[PDB]
Swiss-Prot record, chain A:
Ig-like C2-type domain: residues covered: 3-82, 84-166
Binding partners and assembly: Forms a heterooligomeric complex with ITAM-containing signaling subunits, either a homodimer of CD247, a homodimer of FCER1G or a heterodimer of CD247 and FCER1G. Interacts (via transmembrane domain) with signaling subunits; this interaction is a prerequisite for receptor complex expression on the cell surface and intracellular signal transduction. Binds the Fc region of antigen-complexed IgG with a preference for IgG1 and IgG3 isotypes. Interacts with CD2; this interaction is involved in NK cell activation and cytotoxicity.
Induction field: Up-regulated in a monocyte subset upon exposure to IL10, TGFB and MCSF.
Additional information: Encoded by one of two nearly identical genes: FCGR3A (shown here) and FCGR3B which are expressed in a tissue-specific manner.
Residues of the full protein shown: 22 to 192 of 254
GO cellular component, one term: external side of plasma membrane
Function: Receptor for the invariable Fc fragment of immunoglobulin gamma (IgG). Optimally activated upon binding of clustered antigen-IgG complexes displayed on cell surfaces, triggers lysis of antibody-coated cells, a process known as antibody-dependent cellular cytotoxicity (ADCC). Does not bind free monomeric IgG, thus avoiding inappropriate effector cell activation in the absence of antigenic trigger. Mediates IgG effector functions on natural killer (NK) cells.
The protein's name: Low affinity immunoglobulin gamma Fc region receptor III-A
Residues carrying a glycan: Q33, N40, Q69, N157, Q164
Tissue-by-tissue expression: Expressed in natural killer cells (at protein level). Expressed in a subset of circulating monocytes (at protein level).
Post-translational modification summary for this protein: Glycosylated. Contains high mannose- and complex-type oligosaccharides. Glycosylation at Asn-157 is mandatory for high affinity binding to the Fc and for discrimination between fucosylated and afucosylated IgG glycoforms.
Compartments, record wording: Cell membrane; Secreted
Gene giving rise to this polypeptide: FCGR3A
Single GO MF descriptor: IgG binding
Keywords (A to Z) from UniProt: Cell membrane, Disulfide bond, Glycoprotein, IgG-binding protein, Immunity, Immunoglobulin domain, Membrane, Phosphoprotein, Receptor, Repeat, Secreted, Signal, Transmembrane, Transmembrane helix
Swiss-Prot record, chain B:
Region annotation (CH3) ranges: 109-212
Gene: IGHG1
Name of the featured protein: Immunoglobulin heavy constant gamma 1
Impact reported for K90A: Does not affect binding to FCGR1A. Only slightly affects binding to FCGR2A and FCGR3A. Impairs binding to complement component C1q. Impairs complement-dependent cytotoxicity
GO biological process: adaptive immune response; antibacterial humoral response; antibody-dependent cellular cytotoxicity; B cell receptor signaling pathway; complement activation, classical pathway; complement-dependent cytotoxicity
Start and end residues of each Ig-like domain: 6-105, 114-210
Disulfide pattern: C29-C89, C135-C193
Leader sequence segment: none
Native source species: Homo sapiens (Human)
Highest taxon listed in the record's lineage: Eukaryota
GO molecular function terms attached to this record: antigen binding; Fc-gamma receptor I complex binding; immunoglobulin receptor binding
Disease: Multiple myeloma: A malignant tumor of plasma cells usually arising in the bone marrow and characterized by diffuse involvement of the skeletal system, hyperglobulinemia, Bence-Jones proteinuria and anemia. Complications of multiple myeloma are bone pain, hypercalcemia, renal failure and spinal cord compression. The aberrant antibodies that are produced lead to impaired humoral immunity and patients have a high prevalence of infection. Amyloidosis may develop in some patients.
Residue ranges, annotated region (CH2): 1-108
Extracellular side: 1-212
Amino acid sequence: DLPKAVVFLEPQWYRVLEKDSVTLKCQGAYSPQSTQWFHNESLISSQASSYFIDAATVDDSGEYRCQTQLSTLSDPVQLEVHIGWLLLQAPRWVFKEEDPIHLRCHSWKNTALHKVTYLQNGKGRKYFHHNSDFYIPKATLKDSGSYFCRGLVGSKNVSSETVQITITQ
Amino acid sequence: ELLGGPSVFLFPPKPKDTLMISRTPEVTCVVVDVSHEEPEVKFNWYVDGVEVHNAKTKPREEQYNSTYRVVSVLTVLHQDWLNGKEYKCKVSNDALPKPIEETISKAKGQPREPQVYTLPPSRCELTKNQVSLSCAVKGFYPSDIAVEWESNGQPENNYKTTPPVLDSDGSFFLVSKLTVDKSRWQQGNVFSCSVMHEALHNHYTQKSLSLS
Amino acid sequence: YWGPMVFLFPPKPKDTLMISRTPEVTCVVVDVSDEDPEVKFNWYVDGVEVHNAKTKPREEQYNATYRVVSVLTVLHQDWLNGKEYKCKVSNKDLPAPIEKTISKAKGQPREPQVCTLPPSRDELTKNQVSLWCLVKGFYPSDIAVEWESNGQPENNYKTTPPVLDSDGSFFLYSKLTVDKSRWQQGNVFSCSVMHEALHNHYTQKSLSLS
Ligand SMILES: *[C@@H]1O[C@H](CO[C@H]2O[C@@H](C)[C@@H](O)[C@@H](O)[C@@H]2O)[C@@H](O[C@@H]2O[C@H](CO)[C@@H](O[C@@H]3O[C@H](CO[C@H]4O[C@H](CO)[C@@H](O)[C@H](O)[C@@H]4O[C@@H]4O[C@H](CO)[C@@H](O[C@@H]5O[C@H](CO)[C@H](O)[C@H](O)[C@H]5O)[C@H](O)[C@H]4NC(C)=O)[C@@H](O)[C@H](O[C@H]4O[C@H](CO)[C@@H](O)[C@H](O)[C@@H]4O[C@@H]4O[C@H](CO)[C@@H](O)[C@H](O)[C@H]4NC(C)=O)[C@@H]3O)[C@H](O)[C@H]2NC(C)=O)[C@H](O)[C@H]1NC(C)=O
Ligand SMILES: *[C@@H]1O[C@H](CO[C@H]2O[C@@H](C)[C@@H](O)[C@@H](O)[C@@H]2O)[C@@H](O[C@@H]2O[C@H](CO)[C@@H](O[C@@H]3O[C@H](CO[C@H]4O[C@H](CO)[C@@H](O)[C@H](O)[C@@H]4O[C@@H]4O[C@H](CO)[C@@H](O[C@@H]5O[C@H](CO)[C@H](O)[C@H](O)[C@H]5O)[C@H](O)[C@H]4NC(C)=O)[C@@H](O)[C@H](O[C@H]4O[C@H](CO)[C@@H](O)[C@H](O)[C@@H]4O[C@@H]4O[C@H](CO)[C@@H](O)[C@H](O)[C@H]4NC(C)=O)[C@@H]3O)[C@H](O)[C@H]2NC(C)=O)[C@H](O)[C@H]1NC(C)=O
Ligand SMILES: *[C@@H]1O[C@H](CO)[C@@H](O[C@@H]2O[C@H](CO)[C@@H](O[C@@H]3O[C@H](CO[C@H]4O[C@H](CO)[C@@H](O)[C@H](O)[C@@H]4O)[C@@H](O)[C@H](O[C@H]4O[C@H](CO)[C@@H](O)[C@H](O)[C@@H]4O)[C@@H]3O)[C@H](O)[C@H]2NC(C)=O)[C@H](O)[C@H]1NC(C)=O
Ligand SMILES: *[C@@H]1O[C@H](CO)[C@@H](O[C@@H]2O[C@H](CO)[C@@H](O)[C@H](O)[C@H]2NC(C)=O)[C@H](O)[C@H]1NC(C)=O
């Protein structure tokens, strides 16, 4: 009868750093709608279609659900607010063979980061002078494993937590 | 333009301070690159992960690269440093995403007792007006060691000690060279070489040397 | 800011002193990106350009960076006479080329004194004995110390780095570990030193159980 509402993230990253901005949008019916937001399964007084987080704190973590008047309650969406200098972000972490793998090494407060290295299982894969996205056009099974990025913020040597990338056949 | 915010460096106590019970061994936490805009720096100290509150903070000093430098000092217990306790300096500042932690400990590995030998002047100095006395200290681990010279109770002023050198077995060796006038050597004067290390009995040893 | 860093290294003391050997000055370019083009080198011995430098191609490192190494062969006396050596690192998308310069340490050259020390009696009653060589009163710190038995190279030795003495000159200690039996046989061990302030850049000192 009624469409199942869907929570989208803008930007798409479900893992963020403190102080980043996250906009949560609610897709109920396609025609632009009384919107209702949930965080940690309790209502937020925000009735707008978008729920804007200006600067993320650790409390912004948890499940998120939305419901418009012309839609059914949405599936939950997790949000992880991390504390640190660097976070390795990706659209997804599960890749089919020959799919593109596109990663970014995001810095806290968008601090200029230079001499960036992306590492797989302890070995470096790619080095840039300035911060740049890591990109593999065609995924193989050898591209599977544990990934983290590092670099210099000014003179300080900083690194992100490792994330696991798997390649399915 | 201090993009990274302040950075932290943690220094160990001086070898001699940990060995003599009458001395005061200190662990030093130096914080550099503190910005004028965000100068407030908070220190937290942990001994084996347990917070202590007896640290002294020295006041902030301006540097010529227009940045601040703050030093915190913690006096450690002699036995605790020697037994391999970890000392953690935790530093807070608003230019950082989270407090920065540093950790120091006495070098891991089994301690080895040094061997001390004295070596009379070489044949090369028979014509020279002054002579070199050598103090070979070898087979010690870790490199934390101190060496001094004395004659008739009075400490000798004219000596240089080579840095610890890694030997083939993993232990360290060094040599201390005392320079004295030949005439003092002609006379049956006794010079002594005092060596301090954690693996020595009572943290002390002394070897003497004379024209016998 | 460009990215890659440049380091210039001096030749090994032995190479500069032994006439049969080849002393080299090495220019290393680290942190070369894959997106960097071809790195070009220009060498200058007192402003004057030379073109005898064999430059190795870019080499991939374990951290995904690249390393370009350029080696120049230098004349023995050129280095000793205190000549300036420039390395010019140039790239297609580089605003100003990086220039690095090194030369032999300046100051009054002082001849080393070689002093052999027999093993301590208080060590003579152990499995292996150690022989000592006090090399002192030399400037600059650039030196090479070696051991031989009856004129043939001995391996089992360790040397302290040069230490600054009260008079401004340097000294060091070399320890050679030998089997007590080889010392008892009356074999002639010798401590050989190479330094710029020595005649023929070489001297030697005998040591044996008399
Ligand atoms: C702005 O200016 C700041 C300083 O002022 C400068 O201004 C000008 C005038 C200029 O000309 C300078 O000369 C002047 O200093 C400047 O701050 C500096 O930042 C540097 C980093 O950017 C720091 O470099 C580090 O140095 C460490 C060693 O420091 C000692 O030695 C140097 C001389 O070599 C000396 O200058 C220092 O003061 C320091 O001396 C020691 O001081 C302690 C404590 O004060 C003494 O302890 C004694 O203790 C007894 C107790 O019994 C007693 O209480 C005494 O009173 C007490 O003094 C020591 O005796 C004394 N030692 C000596 C020999 O004198 C290095 O260890 C360190 O290396 C580490 O980091 C490197 C990367 O940065 C890395 O390459 C290296 O591998 C190493 O990495 C570490 O490795 C460890 C394992 O081995 C790991 O566990 C670590 O995690 C790891 N760390 C990291 C980060 O990776 C480093 O090179 C410099 O110390 C500091 N200077 C001062 C004075 O604070 C600032 O950078 C400037 N800013 C800008 C933007 O330019
Ligand atoms: C990625 O990883 C890179 C390497 O990682 C590994 O990669 C593997 C594949 C494999 O290659 C591994 O081996 C390797 O570990 C890494 O590159 C590194 O970058 C560092 C900087 O970020 C460099 O540090 C510098 O080191 C200089 C000394 O380096 C020697 O010693 C180290 C070991 O400690 C060694 O690794 C080096 O290769 C080098 O060894 C010497 O090499 C020369 C030339 O090949 C040899 O000489 C020649 O020998 C041949 C015979 O073979 C022949 O006889 C020739 O005649 C002769 O010339 C030597 O034999 C050999 N010696 C030894 C003992 O081994 C330091 O001088 C330098 O210090 C200066 O700069 C620092 C700041 O950057 C500063 O802290 C310091 O105070 C000093 O400061 C100033 O520097 C200025 C210039 O910048 C000068 O103008 C000033 O004078 C000076 N001021 C003062 C007061 O001193 C520095 O620390 C490191 O060399 C380099 N390693 C290699 C292997 O290239 C890279 O960073 C990584 N990238 C990323 C993004 O993470
Ligand atoms: C930011 O901070 C990190 C430090 O955490 C830096 O990364 C380190 O970089 C140094 C180089 O400066 C690395 O040191 C080198 O590690 C190499 C690792 O080899 C691996 O693979 C082989 C298998 O082929 C294994 O044997 C080995 O166990 C390792 O798993 C070594 O090959 C290097 O050895 C060289 O030097 C030694 C001298 O003792 C020689 O004996 C060797 O012949 C050889 O020449 C060297 O030790 C270090 O490992 C890095 N650490 C990490 C965690 O990555 C960054 O560079 C720094 N800066 C930036 C801008 O990111
Ligand atoms: C919503 O729930 C999450 C738990 O999923 C809360 O996040 C935790 O917050 C505490 C500090 O308050 C941290 O120690 C935890 O690490 C956080 N958990 C995770 C998984 O990151 C969050 O605080 C809750 N927010 C509200 C408004 O109720």
